[PDB]
Amino acid sequence: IDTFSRTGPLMEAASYPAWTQQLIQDCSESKRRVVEHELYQRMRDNKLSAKVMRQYLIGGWPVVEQFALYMAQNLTKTRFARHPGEDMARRWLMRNIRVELNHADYWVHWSRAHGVTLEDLQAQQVPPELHALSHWCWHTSSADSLIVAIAATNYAIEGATGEWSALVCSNGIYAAAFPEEDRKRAMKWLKMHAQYDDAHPWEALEIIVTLAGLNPTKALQAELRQAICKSYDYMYLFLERCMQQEKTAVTRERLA
Amino acid sequence: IDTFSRTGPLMEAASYPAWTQQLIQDCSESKRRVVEHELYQRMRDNKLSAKVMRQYLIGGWPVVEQFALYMAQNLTKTRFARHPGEDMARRWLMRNIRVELNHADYWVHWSRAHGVTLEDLQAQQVPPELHALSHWCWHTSSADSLIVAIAATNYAIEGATGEWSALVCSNGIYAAAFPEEDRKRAMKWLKMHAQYDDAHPWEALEIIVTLAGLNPTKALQAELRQAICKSYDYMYLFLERCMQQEKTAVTRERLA
Numbered sequence: 157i158d159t160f161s162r163t164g165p166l167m168e169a170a171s172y173p174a175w176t177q178q179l180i181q182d183c184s185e186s187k188r189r190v191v192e193h194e195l196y197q198r199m200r201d202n203k204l205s206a207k208v209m210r211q212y213l214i215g216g217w218p219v220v221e222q223f224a225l226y227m228a229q230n231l232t233k234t235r236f237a238r239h240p241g242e243d244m245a246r247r248w249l250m251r252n253i254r255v256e257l258n259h260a261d262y263w264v265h266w267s268r269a270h271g272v273t274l275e276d277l278q279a280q281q282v283p284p285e286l287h288a289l290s291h292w293c294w295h296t297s298s299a300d301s302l303i304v305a306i307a308a309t310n311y312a313i314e315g316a317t318g319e320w321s322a323l324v325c326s327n328g329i330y331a332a333a334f335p336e337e338d339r340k341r342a343m344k345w346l347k348m349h350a351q352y353d354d355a356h357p358w359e360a361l362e363i364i365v366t367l368a369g370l371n372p373t374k375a376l377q378a379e380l381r382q383a384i385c386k387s388y389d390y391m392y393l394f395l396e397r398c399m400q401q402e403k404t405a406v407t408r409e410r411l412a
Numbered sequence: 413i414d415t416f417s418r419t420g421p422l423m424e425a426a427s428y429p430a431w432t433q434q435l436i437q438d439c440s441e442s443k444r445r446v447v448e449h450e451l452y453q454r455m456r457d458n459k460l461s462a463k464v465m466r467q468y469l470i471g472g473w474p475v476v477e478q479f480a481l482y483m484a485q486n487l488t489k490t491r492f493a494r495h496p497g498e499d500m501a502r503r504w505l506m507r508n509i510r511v512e513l514n515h516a517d518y519w520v521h522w523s524r525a526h527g528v529t530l531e532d533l534q535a536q537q538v539p540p541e542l543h544a545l546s547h548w549c550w551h552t553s554s555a556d557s558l559i560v561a562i563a564a565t566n567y568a569i570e571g572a573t574g575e576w577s578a579l580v581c582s583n584g585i586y587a588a589a590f591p592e593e594d595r596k597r598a599m600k601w602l603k604m605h606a607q608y609d610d611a612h613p614w615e616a617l618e619i620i621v622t623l624a625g626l627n628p629t630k631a632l633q634a635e636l637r638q639a640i641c642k643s644y645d646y647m648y649l650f651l652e653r654c655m656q657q658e659k660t661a662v663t664r665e666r667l668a
């Protein structure tokens with residue numbers, strides 16, 4: 157039968173098969189260097205330059221705007237009662253597309269609090285290192301299997317995003333730096349995503365495990381690992397380029 | 413500007429531009445012959461043969477199963493803040509994909525109440541006249557513009573479906589023919605769709621009008637009309653083939 161059914165708590169690695177625990181371990185350093193990135197420690201402390209903050213918001217926009225569209229593309233690959241994991245995916249995607257209803261609007265508001273206009277967002281004037289994530293997300297959503305594309309976007313990206321957004325909000329400095337009358341609206345996107353204990357990525361993982369079963373091939377495991385690490389690695393590429401610009405911007409004003 | 417904003421009530425033709433009222437008039441006979449079809453008058457009265465009832469349920473299944481998938485494909489065509497109608501479509505599609513969460517399950521239950529198993533549904537052993545609707549729906553959802561595909565599926569098909577399902581439920585005979593212990597579960601799909609005053613098709617129309625504006629080209633109007641009438645016409649083709657089989661089945665037992 158090879159059929160997976162969770163007994164343990166949703167949000168614990170030990171509730172899943174050994175291969176899934178292995179997958180988490182194999183991707184852990186790729187994840188870590190994103191969720192603990194220096195850029196986020198600086199953002200938390202309100203230290204980032206206007207230039208970099210602007211690039212971050214513009215660069216992140218396409219992935220945020222199109223996030224429910226990746227989910228939609230994945231829904232399009234599912235069929236009713238073809239496999240238990242596939243029914244689980246269908247229902248989950250139908251429920252969670254709705255969750256994103258206002259999230260692009262919140263990003264627009266976050267952006268405007270830093271002087272980034274809707275026009276600025278739409279112009280997409282950022283380095284290519286910043287656009288790579290969006291192209292990967294569409295490629296996997298378009299061309300890959302459901303299980304792989306869900307791993308790349310709902311597990312990897314949303315999981316890491318819960319953690320970086322929690323880090324940004326973790327000491328109150330960033331939020332308190334906004335004028336009181338601007339703060340609620342500016343912070344909304346971050347507040348809605350800020351959680352270490354968010355079920356979303358664990359629900360995605362559960363779906364992936366159900367799709368794959370107890371004994372997936374090594375080849376499928378490799379496909380998942382590579383897709384998940386690709387997502388983290390493109391986030392890392394984005395952040396590294398941002399930090400290069402940060403050093404230049406800060407250094408210029410230090411010397412000026 | 414050419415921009416449309418509704419002043420009147422949602423569910424009234426007079427609230428929309430003259431071209432939209434014209435479009436409704438041009439499609440009205442195509443619609444009528446579906447929503448008043450003899451098959452539905454017979455279904456209402458519990459008269460349909462086991463054979464035809466079975467074919468109806470099997471034949472309708474793909475469109476029901478894939479209905480949220482058409483919506484998903486249409487969501488994939490939208491972009492944030494590119495046009496006011498397109499924002500309206502995006503938000504509406506994200507909200508209404510969720511609405512369908514349980515609807516395929518309800519159809520399965522309706523089907524089982526007539527001895528049609530999930531296996532039967534999956535086998536799709538029906539005439540080609542019955543499959544044409546599903547192929548059209550996927551073609552338009554896949555290849556056409558958002559405005560056209562939404563007109564074909566959320567306006568035309570869901571609108572007509574509100575009306576035929578209301579007709580089937582209109583005198584209590586069909587429902588009362590089910591044994592009491594089987595009735596709630598058997599009737600659920602029909603009950604959830606049975607409405608003449610459903611907002612869904614009127615919300616779809618409003619989106620279409622907002623997308624098209626006050627002065628769409630004659631060419632776009634023609635594309636909408638032809639897409640809407642195609643949907644009704646494939647429903648009509650389905651129903652005509654069903655009634656041909658009904659006459660044969662009933663006549664055989666009359667003479668036997």
Ligand SMILES: CCCCCCCCC/C=C/C(=O)O
Pocket residue numbers: 215216217219220223256259260289313314317349391392394395
């Ligand atoms: C390091 C690159 C930053 C990418 C920007 C975050 C993308 C987050 C996608 C999720 C959006 C949402 O749930 O509303």
Ligand SMILES: CCCCCCCCC/C=C/C(=O)O
Pocket residue numbers: 471472473475476479512515516545569570573605647648650651
């Ligand atoms: C005449 C052909 C019958 C087609 C079968 C109805 C298709 C209805 C599509 C809507 C399904 C839903 O809202 O859950």
Ligand SMILES: [Fe+3]
Pocket residue numbers: 255256259349
């Ligand atoms: Fe979100």
Ligand SMILES: [Fe+3]
Pocket residue numbers: 511512515605
């Ligand atoms: Fe429905």
